């Protein structure tokens, strides 16, 4: 079958890991500061 | 106008556009129609409605 030459290859390639910047937990995200803040007089 | 191509009927609206251009009898008929139209225009514009009112 001498006709138009074309190659079909589906692209589903996974991207490389992004490694985005990491959020920093608040001081009130730790159990001990939470206890100190809640137990305030 | 059946002689000039760009002043004729569009070819996509009629099936027989091929065998229309260059015909002289059909051009005679069209010329008679246009002369009748021009006579009507003159009669309406110069006798009946001189002020040009066309809604009657």
């Amino acid at each position: 079958r001498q006709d138009y030459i074309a190659k079909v290859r589906y692209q589903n390639d996974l991207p490389a890991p992004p490694c985005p910047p990491k959020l920093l937990k608040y001081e009130i995200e730790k159990e001990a500061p939470q206890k100190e803040f809640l137990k305030d007089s | 106008d059946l002689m000039d191509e760009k002043n004729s009927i569009k070819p996509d609206v009629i099936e027989y556009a091929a065998d229309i251009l260059g015909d002289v009898e059909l051009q005679k008929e069209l010329n008679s129609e246009y002369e009748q139209l021009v006579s009507d225009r003159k009669f309406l514009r110069e006798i009946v409605f001189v002020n040009g009112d066309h809604n009657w």
Partner: protein, 39 residues
């Protein structure tokens, strides 16, 4: 301490959601009924 303080905004599975998530539950059901249950 770094690991404890580190927080990641989006999860490993949720990274494809980002700011605009979409649902393919119907797609999953159709796949189950037409691939795993395919005759």
């Amino acid at each position: 301490e770094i690991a404890s303080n580190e927080r990641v905004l989006i999860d490993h599975n949720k990274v494809l959601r980002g700011l605009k998530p979409k649902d393919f539950s119907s797609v999953a059901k159709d796949c189950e009924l037409r691939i795993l249950k395919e005759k």
